[PDB]
């Protein structure tokens, strides 16, 4: 343990911005944790940001208001940020710094884990195989998610990506063939209505016992937003690789994380990078997205679903562009589909899952999954083209096979995509809906389904 | 040695009491001994870029000076090993620590000092011999495939004072000891070489021998040489594994070195699973390719200074195995993921950006890297000759060859196999485009072809002409109605499709089309272009003779000749010999000639 | 020295090549019997027949006494090296001093030795010879051993440079049997 | 002479980038030369970039990898960089720093010359007027070259600029209306294929006792690419203005020179220009290009032919743009003509030679040279306009004269430009081909040729 007494310093030598510069520190340690006591008595917390000889620069979480250099005390903890972790954290609500905000006690620890974590050995990770069932047919049926994937959701401002995140959180599970599953939710930079919605919606839909919620609000300290996803992922790693559960981690608005990163970078007096964000943002996002996957010898996984809002609906902004280099696929929340009053407004033509081939098939979902998905994609694209030609050629000069690609369109968007915010559809219900839609066309027009399957599932 | 820590601000540590510390030297910081590198000196102070996380380093911590820059260990223990950009033994960390993580400040040797190796010295060497730098003075029997030649470092010289008898030694025992000008050098089975320095040779020769891959395309139309430089597009769903699998299994290389430069986490888990499964056949037996293969494996969260130095570790390993006399083929997967780590390392040092933010020295690095490939005459006495062939992979945003890295690498490399996704969606494999691909090594392979396959280059030019003509006849068939078709053009549009479907298309999941030797390739192309020639002359002679021949008569007079043409690619090279397939192709030729004379 | 052959490096390489030619000669003819060949290489064997140290022959090269054209030395060394390869591949059998000089001066007059077909057939013969150094008694191993011994004796009686179609037949037969599946 | 002993300092204050900083120097001299010996005995050389009091800032040509501040020993030479220069340098091969790489001895100097040169008094020059006949009709007939000109080749990566250069070198000579060049070749940052090509071509298609090579390859020190063209040009000036010969200087990839210059500029944080290149790149390239011409009273000359590679075929990039403001023309090598298997792939519209008007005409080549050239330019431009109009309005909307222009375009590109790589066309053959091309049109369409020229040259 640490059995030596702690040292308190009344030697503040400077205050500027969020930084307090102390002198005569004995052996200042980097990234250490400090407890400050203000002249009147209010207590604040900080972290050492720079070290030089007998001098430390502490960044205070709650600001430097009312701090003077003659009566403020700083007690040095002696170590770095280690969080307590146990399995009882499932069913609780903590804030960004990890303290309970649900009228309950503090976490009785099973271990104290360093929140920075170590990289997984590339030689121990194995390939993702089975399926994570979200209950949303636009994702389950056509953009399937494997156990151990990392697949983001791209959206914008005003689009309903928080309700999609909430539905995924309160419906997701494992496929019921013929359940050691947990969810860790990390909300970063949300306002108070969003946080209220998350908290109440999870705790009143009878599901808050396989969920651990970390809520960080837009008026919270901007340093806590830097440590929120690292607490979430430390808890997820404990659960998955020491208790052998299957964990799904949802991280909402990584763009707010990027903004907080920019703030704490500029506080270090670092020159900005391309378009505002630091030059090392790739490595910082990668130390988050890569705390995932299956590993050899353990029966647990970690699946990650980052959620972003694209500024100006641009797909080449630094945040979406760099998230594309680390993750496998993407889901697109569309605005033309949202204005047409479709929920969920997921565009399946630009969306992709790079590891769907591994998640679906015989013994995982069903033997007809890949063919149904391919045929639904093909028919949807063809129907969109047909609806384009209909506007210049006229609806009275269309074929009879082009009149089928225009009923499939309406039925597909209103019966397959459009779901309902409290409607849970298992994978088999999704595939049965797919077949009900594919039975619009004669068996001879479904070109992408092998004849050995058009015999078993078409005649029903 | 043993400076101390003065300040820590991010990844940048400052160390006092470091008087005689060279630039770009490596050091170990703290009590967990994190590895870092010296980037600036000032008086008695040194500025260090630490590779790992500096969280927890206090003032006064020790700083250990290593004395050398980033180097690699070269000795027995490289084949079948799995490293990263710093050459850390991943598969040994995984088994000594029994954890699924890479510990922080882990200090394990890259080559194990436990294995006993079978070492036999050169039988002519004795006390008093004159041995220089490069001389092979022993052999370690590494495995049943690769003999490991023990060579003197490129900068030593002297007279043998002691040489060890044959026997079993680990990579710590003194196997040689020589003398020069009154100073002794002891040498063991392992030598250390800095990764940013080219290894010396006696002369850089021109590359004049093919790199056989086994595909009919890439071997006829776009050839590479032993010692060349290739680039492919590394993208999703383009059928990219054919290149590396062909190189590993069916190739004239001796040693294979694969490099991942910052790949995704689950994309590395697929390579590290698939590669230990591939097999070869040697001397009739079936062996594993990981008996002559080494892998360098990085992911996106490993240190940024290992994702950058990976390319150099790989090329130094291949230059080490080239100096033995072997022919090595290195492959760097997603060189773009290396360029991005380069840009980020620059950005950290607050360096002026260049076009698109990449550093100023990007083309210099990309050119001095590819200038390390080629065929050489090796330094040292026993008169050998080796080669290194580099295959890079680039990932242009959305297939746009204007990114600085893609522009530079296309300006440098001589071959470019353009894999396309459009052809992959049509089940056309190998999905090489054949219209944007090229090869500028075709004039170096002219003595070789004219000495071994004399009647090939004309067939190559003819096939390229036919495949271009079937393509620039596209609007003629769409904007007009397929009818205004001169018989020459019907003959083209049919034989070119014959080529596209039965020469350029190959299926590896078969017993006959995994490997296509070159005699079979030239036979299959000669029969097709000979058909084309005869069927074209038969038409254009009877141009005005009242007996107008068209493709409709040619396709009815020879209805089995055409099938047997479309069935040439089923002749097994193993179950049928070489003389057998040669005689079969000759019989088909004579039947074609007959059935063309019985038409006029 | 186009690129990396410093003076120190160049002359160390020269001294090493001189020593290597001396060793190859001492192995190819331990009892002096190829007086013609030991005469043709006299200017480089003199520096080794009497004991000069490494530095004495080094300063001799820097001065200019001993040969110091590394390329001429390389092309004169490849010939003796391939001679030693030919006379050590057929180890149990032997060759007499007429065919040795015949083959030697047939190699001396080749345009490029590394591009010849004496080099190629020596590669093939050494492949066959190296597969059988630690083989396991079996049908195909015994057949390869028999045909290899017959090939070695035929080469020891005829030579490698001139065409002898019995040797060609046995060569391609052994190289087709070696690459045949053990099943 | 300098008869005093040299001072050697082990007083290194700090290494950083490519710059070493020394203190306690005794009267430091600007631009002096320093010899550094490293702790392991290896030797490097540097040049003083700034002096201040007792401090000197040396810039090492080979880099600062391995230098320390306790054992590296620097010896100050006492003078600026002077190269030894002689006439035996013809027929020799050196590296980019002047050492022999052809197994010969060092230069026995006839003189020691300062490699920065000296600007030639603009009053002591002679305007160049004697036309070089290169045997290439695209250069001879439309972009004529005088003896003393500086005219670069603007090419890109992958195009055949090396063969164009070697053909100019082996074909060039004066015009015969009724003895040879000495080549000086410097290559900066080339690969081994290019050096092999040039060495093989010189000693085969001519003589190698009239060439002096300075080969700096792609795996050689970058900061020594800065002094290679100055060594080449000092040799050229000695051979031309003191031994009275006619020199031809070929500087290969001034792009690599410019990029090494950018790297050294960024190393010490100077003001940039466009795309990061230093603000003094014009004043630096002009000290290289302006060492080419004739002088009054001496019977030598220097003809410079730099070779460029334009990044992305863009002629507005800083390198071609600043080169075109300094040199007296340019020869543009086109990619669109290379893709049609045309040799030499020279596009004459973005080409220019600024000394042609004074080198052609009566008594120099022939009376009609200039008019034929201007008319070919006009007709080529109008043909390229028609070729792009027909891509919009179709083949059958053109007039009777647009087809005349489209015929001129084809016959010009295939008969005038396209030449063959060993064909030496005297300038009169070029002019006859030009007239055979101009007879496509009636003599009233040729509105740039005066009437008394059309009366004598058009009917024949």
Swiss-Prot record, chains A, D:
Intracellular or extracellular location(s): Apical cell membrane; Melanosome; Cytoplasm; Cytoplasmic vesicle, Secretory vesicle, Synaptic vesicle membrane
Gene3D superfamilies (alphabetical): 3.40.50.12240
InterPro entries in alphabetical order: ATP-synt_VA_C, ATPase_a/bsu_AS, ATPase_F1/V1/A1_a/bsu_N, ATPase_F1/V1/A1_a/bsu_nucl-bd, ATPase_V1-cplx_bsu, P-loop_NTPase, V-ATPase_su_B/beta
Expression (tissue specificity): Kidney; localizes to early distal nephron, encompassing thick ascending limbs and distal convoluted tubules (at protein level).
Alphabetized PROSITE patterns for the sequence: ATPASE_ALPHA_BETA (PS00152)
Membrane topology recorded in Swiss-Prot or TrEMBL: Peripheral membrane protein
Gene Ontology CC annotation, any one: apical plasma membrane
Keywords, in A-Z order: ATP-binding, Cell membrane, Cytoplasm, Cytoplasmic vesicle, Deafness, Disease variant, Hydrogen ion transport, Ion transport, Membrane, Nucleotide-binding, Synapse, Transport
UniProt xrefs under Pfam families: ATP-synt_ab, ATP-synt_ab_N, ATP-synt_VA_C
GO biological process: ATP metabolic process; proton transmembrane transport; regulation of macroautophagy; synaptic vesicle lumen acidification; vacuolar acidification
Sequence positions that bind ATP: 354
Subunit structure, interactors included: V-ATPase is a heteromultimeric enzyme made up of two complexes: the ATP-hydrolytic V1 complex and the proton translocation V0 complex. The V1 complex consists of three catalytic AB heterodimers that form a heterohexamer, three peripheral stalks each consisting of EG heterodimers, one central rotor including subunits D and F, and the regulatory subunits C and H. The proton translocation complex V0 consists of the proton transport subunit a, a ring of proteolipid subunits c9c'', rotary subunit d, subunits e and f, and the accessory subunits ATP6AP1/Ac45 and ATP6AP2/PRR.
Family note: Belongs to the ATPase alpha/beta chains family.
Disease: Zimmermann-Laband syndrome 2: A form of Zimmermann-Laband syndrome, a rare developmental disorder characterized by facial dysmorphism with bulbous nose and thick floppy ears, gingival enlargement, hypoplasia or aplasia of terminal phalanges and nails, hypertrichosis, joint hyperextensibility, and hepatosplenomegaly. Some patients manifest intellectual disability with or without epilepsy. ZLS2 inheritance is autosomal dominant.
Known role: Non-catalytic subunit of the V1 complex of vacuolar(H+)-ATPase (V-ATPase), a multisubunit enzyme composed of a peripheral complex (V1) that hydrolyzes ATP and a membrane integral complex (V0) that translocates protons. V-ATPase is responsible for acidifying and maintaining the pH of intracellular compartments and in some cell types, is targeted to the plasma membrane, where it is responsible for acidifying the extracellular environment.
Protein name: V-type proton ATPase subunit B, brain isoform
Taxonomic path: Eukaryota, Metazoa, Chordata, Craniata, Vertebrata
Swiss-Prot record, chain B:
Recorded GO CC terms: apical plasma membrane; clathrin-coated vesicle membrane; cytosol; endosome membrane; extracellular exosome; extrinsic component of synaptic vesicle membrane; Golgi membrane; intracellular membrane-bounded organelle
Sequence positions bearing Phosphoserine: 368
Consequence when changing residue 233 to R: Found in a patient with severe developmental disorder; uncertain significance
Subunit-level organization: V-ATPase is a heteromultimeric enzyme made up of two complexes: the ATP-hydrolytic V1 complex and the proton translocation V0 complex. The V1 complex consists of three catalytic AB heterodimers that form a heterohexamer, three peripheral stalks each consisting of EG heterodimers, one central rotor including subunits D and F, and the regulatory subunits C and H. The proton translocation complex V0 consists of the proton transport subunit a, a ring of proteolipid subunits c9c'', rotary subunit d, subunits e and f, and the accessory subunits ATP6AP1/Ac45 and ATP6AP2/PRR.
NCBIfam families associated with the record: PRK04192.1, V-ATPase_V1_A
Family note: Belongs to the ATPase alpha/beta chains family.
Descriptive protein name: V-type proton ATPase catalytic subunit A
Organism, scientific name: Homo sapiens (Human)
Organism lineage: Eukaryota, Metazoa, Chordata, Craniata, Vertebrata
């Amino acid at each position: 343990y640490l059995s030596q007494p702690r040292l308190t310093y009344k030697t503040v030598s400077g205050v500027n911005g969020p930084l307090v510069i102390l002198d005569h520190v004995k052996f200042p340690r980097y990234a250490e944790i400090v407890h400050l006591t203000l002249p009147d008595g209010t207590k604040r917390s900080g972290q050492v940001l720079e070290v030089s000889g007998s001098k430390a620069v502490v960044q205070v979480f709650e600001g430097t208001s009312g701090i003077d250099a003659k009566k403020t005390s700083c007690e040095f903890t002696g170590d770095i940020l280690r969080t307590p972790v146990s399995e009882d954290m499932l069913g609780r609500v903590f804030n960004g710094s990890g303290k309970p905000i649900d009228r309950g006690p503090v976490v009785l620890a099973e271990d104290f884990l360093d929140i920075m974590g170590q990289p997984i050995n590339p030689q121990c990770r194995i390939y993702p195989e089975e399926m994570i069932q979200t209950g949303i047919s636009a994702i389950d049926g056509m953009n399937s998610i494997a156990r151990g994937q990392k697949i983001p959701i791209f959206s914008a401002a005003g689009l309903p990506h928080n309700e999609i995140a909430a539905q995924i959180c309160r419906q997701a599970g494992l496929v019921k063939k013929s359940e050691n599953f947990a969810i860790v939710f990390a909300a970063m930079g949300v306002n108070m209505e969003t946080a209220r919605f998350f908290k109440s919606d999870f705790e009143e839909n009878g599901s808050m016992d396989n969920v651990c919620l970390f809520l960080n609000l837009a008026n919270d300290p901007t340093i806590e937003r830097i440590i929120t996803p690292r607490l979430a992922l430390t808890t997820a790693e404990f659960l998955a690789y020491q208790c052998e559960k299957h964990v799904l981690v949802i991280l909402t608005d990584m763009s707010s994380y990027a903004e907080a990163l920019r703030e704490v970078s500029a506080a270090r007096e670092e020159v900005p990078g391309r378009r505002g964000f630091p030059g090392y943002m790739y490595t910082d996002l990668a130390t988050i997205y890569e705390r995932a996957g299956r590993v050899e010898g353990r029966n647990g996984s970690i699946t990650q679903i980052p959620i972003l809002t694209m500024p100006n609906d641009d797909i080449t902004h630094p945040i979406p562009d760099l998230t594309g280099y680390i993750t496998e696929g993407q889901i697109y929340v569309d605005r033309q589909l949202h204005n047409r009053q479709i929920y969920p407004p997921i565009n399946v033509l630009p969306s992709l899952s790079r590891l769907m081939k591994s998640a679906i098939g015989e013994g995982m979902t069903r033997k007809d999954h890949a063919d149904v998905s391919n045929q639904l994609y093909a028919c949807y694209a063809i129907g969109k083209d047909v609806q384009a030609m209909k506007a210049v050629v006229g609806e009275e000069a269309l074929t009879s096979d082009d009149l089928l690609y225009l009923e499939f369109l309406q039925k597909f968007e209103r019966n397959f995509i459009a779901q309902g915010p409290y409607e849970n559809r298992t994978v088999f219900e999704t595939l049965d809906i797919g077949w009900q839609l594919l039975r619009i066309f004669p068996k001879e027009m479904l070109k992408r389904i092998p004849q050995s399957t058009l015999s078993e599932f078409y005649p029903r | 040695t043993f400076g101390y820590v003065h300040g820590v601000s991010g990844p940048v540590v400052t160390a006092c009491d470091m008087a005689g510390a060279a630039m770009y030297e490596l050091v170990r910081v703290g009590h967990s001994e994190l590895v870092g590198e010296i980037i600036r000196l000032e008086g008695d102070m040194a500025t260090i870029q630490v590779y790992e996380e500096t969280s927890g380093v206090s003032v006064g911590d020790p700083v250990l000076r290593t004395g050398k820059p980033l180097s690699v260990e070269l000795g027995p223990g490289i084949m079948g090993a799995i490293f990263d950009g710093i050459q850390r033994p991943l598969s040994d960390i995984s088994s000594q620590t029994q954890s699924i993580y890479i510990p922080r400040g882990v200090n394990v040797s890259a080559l194990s000092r436990d294995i006993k190796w079978d070492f036999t010295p050169c039988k002519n060497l004795r006390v008093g011999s004159h041995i220089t730098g490069g001389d092979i003075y022993g052999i370690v029997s590494e495995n049943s495939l690769i003999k490991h030649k023990i060579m003197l470092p490129p900068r030593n010289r002297g007279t043998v004072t002691y040489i060890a008898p044959p026997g079993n030694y680990d990579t710590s025992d003194v196997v040689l000891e020589l003398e020069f000008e009154g100073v002794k050098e002891k040498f063991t089975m392992v030598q250390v070489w800095p990764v940013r320095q080219v290894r010396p040779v006696t002369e850089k020769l021109p590359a004049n021998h093919p790199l056989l891959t086994g595909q009919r395309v890439l071997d006829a139309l776009f050839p590479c040489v032993q010692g060349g430089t290739t680039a492919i597009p590394g993208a999703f769903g383009c059928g990219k594994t054919v290149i590396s699998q062909s190189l590993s299994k069916y190739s004239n290389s001796d040693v294979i070195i694969y490099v991942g430069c910052g790949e995704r986490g689950n994309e590395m888990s697929e390579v590290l699973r698939d590669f230990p499964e591939l097999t070869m056949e040697v001397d009739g037996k079936v062996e594993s390719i990981m008996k002559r293969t080494a892998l360098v494996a990085n992911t996106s969260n490993m240190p940024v200074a290992a994702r950058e130095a990976s390319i150099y570790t790989g090329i130094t390993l291949s230059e080490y195995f080239r100096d033995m006399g072997y022919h090595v083929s290195m492959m760097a997967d997603s060189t773009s993921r290396w360029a991005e780590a380069l840009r980020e390392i620059s950005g950290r040092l607050a360096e002026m950006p260049a076009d698109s933010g990449y550093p100023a020295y990007l083309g210099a690095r990309l050119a001095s890297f590819y200038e390390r490939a080629g065929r050489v005459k090796c330094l040292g006495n026993p008169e050998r000759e080796g080669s290194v062939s580099i295959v890079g992979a680039v990932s242009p945003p959305g297939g746009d060859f204007s990114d600085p890295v893609t522009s530079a690498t296309l300006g440098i490399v001589q071959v470019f196999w353009g894999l396309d996704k459009k052809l992959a969606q049509r089940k056309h494999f190998p999905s090489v485009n054949w219209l944007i691909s090229y090869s500028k090594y075709m004039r170096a392979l002219d003595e070789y072809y004219d000495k071994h396959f004399t009647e090939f280059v004309p067939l190559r030019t003819k096939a390229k002409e036919i495949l271009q003509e079937e393509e620039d006849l596209a609007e003629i068939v769409q904007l007009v109605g397929k009818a205004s078709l001169a018989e020459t053009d019907k003959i083209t549009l049919e034989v070119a499709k014959l080529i596209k479907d039965d020469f350029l298309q190959q299926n590896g999941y078969t017993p006959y089309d995994r490997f296509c030797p070159f005699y079979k390739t030239v036979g299959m192309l000669s029969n097709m272009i000979a058909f084309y020639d005869m069927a074209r002359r038969a038409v254009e002679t009877t141009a005005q003779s009242d007996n107008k021949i068209t493709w409709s008569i040619i396709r009815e007079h020879m209805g089995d000749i055409l099938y047997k043409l479309s069935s040439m690619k089923f002749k097994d090279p193993l179950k049928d010999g070489e003389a057998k397939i040669k005689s079969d192709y000759a019989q088909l030729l004579e039947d074609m000639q007959n059935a063309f004379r019985s038409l006029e | 020295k186009m690129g990396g052959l410093t003076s120190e490096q160049y002359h160390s390489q020269v001294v090493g090549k001189i020593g290597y030619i001396a060793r190859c000669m001492q192995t190819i003819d331990p009892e002096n019997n190829l007086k013609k060949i030991r005469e043709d290489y006299q200017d480089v064997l003199i520096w080794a027949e009497k004991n000069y140290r490494f530095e004495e022959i080094l300063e001799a090269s820097k001065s200019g006494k001993c040969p110091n054209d590394l390329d001429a030395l390389s092309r004169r060394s490849l010939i003796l090296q391939e001679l030693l390869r030919l006379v050590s591949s057929i180890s149990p059998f032997k060759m007499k001093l007429d065919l040795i000089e015949s083959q030697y001066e047939k190699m001396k007059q080749h345009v490029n030795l590394w591009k010849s077909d004496y080099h190629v057939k020596l590669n093939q013969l050494n492949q066959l010879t190296d597969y059988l150094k630690n083989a396991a008694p079996t049908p195909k191993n015994n057949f390869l051993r028999a045909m290899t011994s017959v090939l070695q004796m035929q080469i020891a009686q005829y030579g490698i440079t001139e065409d002898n179609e019995g040797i060609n037949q046995l060569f391609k037969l052994g190289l087709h049997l070696l690459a045949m599946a053990n099943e």
